[PDB]
């Protein structure tokens, strides 16, 4: 921070810069009015050169490289010329590829040394040396920071030691496994930046713009059993996300929401879509338009934990994570994709059931959505959801017609119906009565009243591991939870 001429903190040896059609932003600090020349080299050969100057009343400089085909290695040099003085900066083993930012709370923070099969996962790096990794230090700030205050893991080739460095240290398992899966598909460099902090609500990760857009109340005394990390508005946006916003990138994956179970829960269907839109706007502008204005944003629908049976804050958050549609992308969440995780539970996790150890399936399901939404591939990435319902009240039956094929295991409490009688509505279990390839028939005979709604898997812990009642027969994806109201 005392060195006058330097790169921004996202720039280092071994990094990945965003590939074509975007141009990669390179920025740093230097002496006011100095000229800065940025050169991309392949050893001694000049690939491209960009020239700029440090603005007269600020001490930063920025260039945008021409778009690059993925691959490498390259070296980036920056030279500051100021009068008769010459200072140079150099980073090597630079690759061009897709840069993904991974963020959220503790289930993004959980590292490869904490997951199932860790020994073998930590050893599987030789084929993935072009999946480069980076982890942001846990820092909060009361104002937006221009540059990261601290980096835990600077850009690196993956090794046993840095993938599994410590419990909730680095490297994020969901992030790593997502990138590894993407590398299998894309076969060009992937950069992974993890920026997460356990026990944090979405308000900490939101700029003031998205909070204002949602009418979020002014902060009071926020800390509780479920909010254990920084909870002041925007303090993690300020320090751990905003400093990256000028860096060109491909997309974001996100795993957060547990700490909103009792913190502006009823606003999460606003604050999460608003965060996505605000990060998009801010990163698009910061990167001089190079990051896509609607860059793909993927997220994990909350998994389960062993809660009180009556607690339905997690089901509410899961619904709000989809802006109350049940699926993404949707009208309020364009170019988003979701991994369902409620069936990826872990009764015996040494980190608590709130921190389940199967991150492999989470990253697999995320990478399906990325392939479809971020890369345009015709790959199934959504689980079966009803597209219409037919109530046969005289027969005591409710037909659910699904838009995909279903594989169904008998489970007479996973569906519930809202039965309104005697001036009250109660949720009653709805047994499964009959099955066809895309139609499930529920029995409603226990409802001696009017049927107002139906819901599925509306519980904090709806099933045992990979034993939810409804899956697609071959995509491996579970039916997502939902609620649907009768006309």
Ligand X SMILES: *[C@@H]1O[C@H](CO)[C@@H](O[C@@H]2O[C@H](CO)[C@@H](O)[C@H](O)[C@H]2NC(C)=O)[C@H](O)[C@H]1NC(C)=O
Q: How many chain residues bind ligand NAG (CB under 6 A)? A: 5
117 binds, among ligand X, ligand NAG, none (CB under 5 to 8 A by kind): ligand X
Sites for ligand X among residues 278-297 (CB under 6 A):
285-286
120 binds, among ligand X, ligand NAG, none (CB under 5 to 8 A by kind): ligand X
353 binds, among ligand X, ligand NAG, none (CB under 5 to 8 A by kind): none
Contact stretch for ligand NAG (CB under 6 A) within 56-64, 116-124, 263-271, 410-418: 263-271
Strands 131-136 and 151-156: antiparallel
Residue 146 as a binder of ligand NAG (CB under 6 A): the answer is no
177 binds, among ligand NAG, ligand X, none (CB under 5 to 8 A by kind): none
Residue 313 as a binder of ligand NAG (CB under 6 A): the answer is no
Binding string, residues 319-338; x marks residues near ligand NAG by CB under 6 A: -----x--------------
Residue 161 makes CB contacts below 8 A (sequence gap 6+) with: none
Residue 30 as a binder of ligand X (CB under 6 A): the answer is no
Residue 246 as a binder of ligand X (CB under 6 A): the answer is yes
Specify the 3-state DSSP secondary structure of 162.
Answer: helix
Dihedral in degrees, nearest 10, Cα atoms 417, 419, 425, 428 = -50
Run of H or E residues at 422 = none
Sites for ligand X among residues 337-376 (CB under 6 A):
360
Specify the 3-state DSSP secondary structure of 175.
Answer: helix
Residue 83 makes CB contacts below 8 A (sequence gap 6+) with: none
**Tally of CB atoms within 10 A around 151:** 16
Q: How far is the CB of 352 from ligand X (least distance, A)?
A: 21
Strands (E) located in 105-222: 131-136, 151-156, 190-196
Sites for ligand X among residues 419-478 (CB under 6 A):
none
Q: How far is the CB of 191 from ligand X (least distance, A)?
A: 19
Residue 418 as a binder of ligand X (CB under 6 A): the answer is no
147 binds, among ligand NAG, ligand X, none (CB under 5 to 8 A by kind): none
Q: How far is CA 114 from CA 159, 193, 339, 355, in A?
A: 15, 19, 20, 10
Instruction: Work out which of 24, 78, 171, 270 binds ligand NAG, going by CB under 6 A.
Output: 270
Q: How far is the CB of 138 from ligand X (least distance, A)?
A: 23
Sites for ligand X among residues 98-127 (CB under 6 A):
116-117, 120-121, 124
Sites for ligand NAG among residues 199-258 (CB under 6 A):
232
Q: How far is the CB of 58 from ligand X (least distance, A)?
A: 7
Specify the 3-state DSSP secondary structure of 107.
Answer: helix
CB 253 within 8 A of CB 368: no
Residue 266 as a binder of ligand NAG (CB under 6 A): the answer is yes
SS (H, E, C) 232-282: CCCHHHHHHHHHHCCCCCCEEEEECCHHHCCCCHHHHHHHHHHHHHHHHHH
Structure tokens at 322: 């989809």
Nearer to ligand X, 63 or 442 (CB): 63
285 binds, among ligand X, ligand NAG, none (CB under 5 to 8 A by kind): ligand X
Dist CA 102 CA 92 (whole Å): 24
Q: How far is the CB of 245 from ligand X (least distance, A)?
A: 6
Preceding omega of 73 cis (within 30 degrees of 0): yes
Rg for the chain (alpha carbons), in Å? 24
Q: How far is CA 147 from CA 36, 230, 249, 273, in A?
A: 19, 19, 16, 26
Nearer to ligand NAG, 321 or 361 (CB): 321
Residue 269 as a binder of ligand NAG (CB under 6 A): the answer is yes
Q: How far is the CB of 39 from ligand X (least distance, A)?
A: 18
442 binds, among ligand X, ligand NAG, none (CB under 5 to 8 A by kind): none
Burial of 294 (0-12, 13-18, 19+ CB in 10 A): middle
Dist CA 2 CA 18 (whole Å): 29
324 binds, among ligand X, ligand NAG, none (CB under 5 to 8 A by kind): ligand NAG
* Widest distance between CA atoms in the chain: 92
Nearer to ligand NAG, 212 or 466 (CB): 212
49 binds, among ligand X, ligand NAG, none (CB under 5 to 8 A by kind): none
CB 9 within 8 A of CB 28: no
Sites for ligand X among residues 37-96 (CB under 6 A):
60, 62
Residues that bind ligand NAG (CB under 6 A): 232, 266, 269-270, 324
Residues that bind ligand X (CB under 6 A): 27, 60, 62, 116-117, 120-121, 124, 246, 285-286, 360
């Amino acid at each position: 921070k005392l060195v006058g001429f330097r790169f921004a903190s996202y720039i280092n040896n071994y990094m990945v810069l965003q590939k074509e059609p975007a141009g990669a932003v390179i920025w740093g600090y230097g002496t006011s009015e100095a000229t800065v020349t940025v050169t991309l080299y392949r050893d001694q050969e000049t690939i491209m050169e960009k020239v700029t100057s440090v603005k007269a009343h600020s001490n930063s400089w920025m260039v945008v490289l021409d778009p690059m085909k993925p691959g490498g290695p390259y070296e980036v040099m920056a030279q500051q010329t100021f009068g008769k003085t010459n200072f140079t900066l150099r980073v090597h083993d630079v690759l061009f590829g897709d840069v993904w930012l991974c963020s959220g709370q503790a289930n993004m923070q959980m590292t490869v040394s904490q997951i199932f099969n860790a020994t073998r996962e930590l050893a599987n790096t030789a084929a993935y040396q072009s999946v480069r990794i980076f982890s942001v230090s846990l820092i909060q700030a009361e104002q937006e920071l221009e540059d990261l205050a601290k980096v835990d893991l600077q850009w690196a080739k993956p090794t046993t030691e840095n993938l599994g460095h410590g419990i909730f240290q680095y490297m994020s398992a969901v992030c790593w496994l997502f990138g590894r899966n993407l590398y299998d598909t894309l076969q060009y460099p992937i950069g992974l930046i993890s920026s997460s902090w356990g026990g944090t609500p979405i308000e900490a990760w939101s700029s003031e713009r998205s909070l204002k857009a949602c009418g979020v109340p002014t902060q009071g005394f926020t800390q509780s059993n479920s909010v254990t990390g920084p909870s002041n508005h925007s303090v993690l946006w300020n320090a751990m996300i905003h400093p990256l916003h000028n860096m060109t990138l491909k997309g974001v994956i996100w795993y957060q929401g547990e700490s909103n179970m009792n913190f502006n829960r009823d606003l999460y269907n606003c604050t999460f879509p608003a965060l996505i839109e605000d990060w998009r706007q801010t990163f698009h502008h910061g990167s001089q338009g190079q990051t896509e204005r609607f860059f793909p944003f993927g997220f994990v629908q909350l998994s389960s934990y062993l809660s009180a049976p009556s607690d339905d804050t997690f089901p509410q958050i899961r619904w709000h994570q989809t802006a109350d549609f049940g699926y993404v992308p949707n009208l309020r969440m364009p170019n988003t994709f979701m991994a369902v995780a409620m069936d990826l539970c872990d009764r015996k996790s040494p980190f608590g059931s709130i921190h389940p150890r199967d991150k492999q399936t989470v990253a697999y399901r995320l990478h399906l959505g990325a392939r479809a939404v971020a890369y345009g591939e015709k790959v199934i990435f959504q689980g079966p959801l009803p597209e219409k319902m037919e109530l046969l009240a005289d027969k005591g039956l409710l037909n659910l017609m699904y838009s995909q094929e279903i594989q169904v295991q008998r489970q007479d409490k996973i569906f519930e119906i809202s039965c309104c009688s005697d001036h009250q509505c109660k949720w009653l279990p709805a047994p499964m009565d009959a099955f066809s390839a895309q139609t499930l028939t529920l029995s409603t005979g226990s409802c001696h009243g009017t049927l107002a709604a139906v819901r599925y898997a509306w519980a904090t812990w709806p099933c045992e591991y990979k034993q939810c009642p409804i899956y697609h027969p071959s995509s491996t994806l579970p039916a997502p939870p939902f609620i649907a109201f009768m006309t």
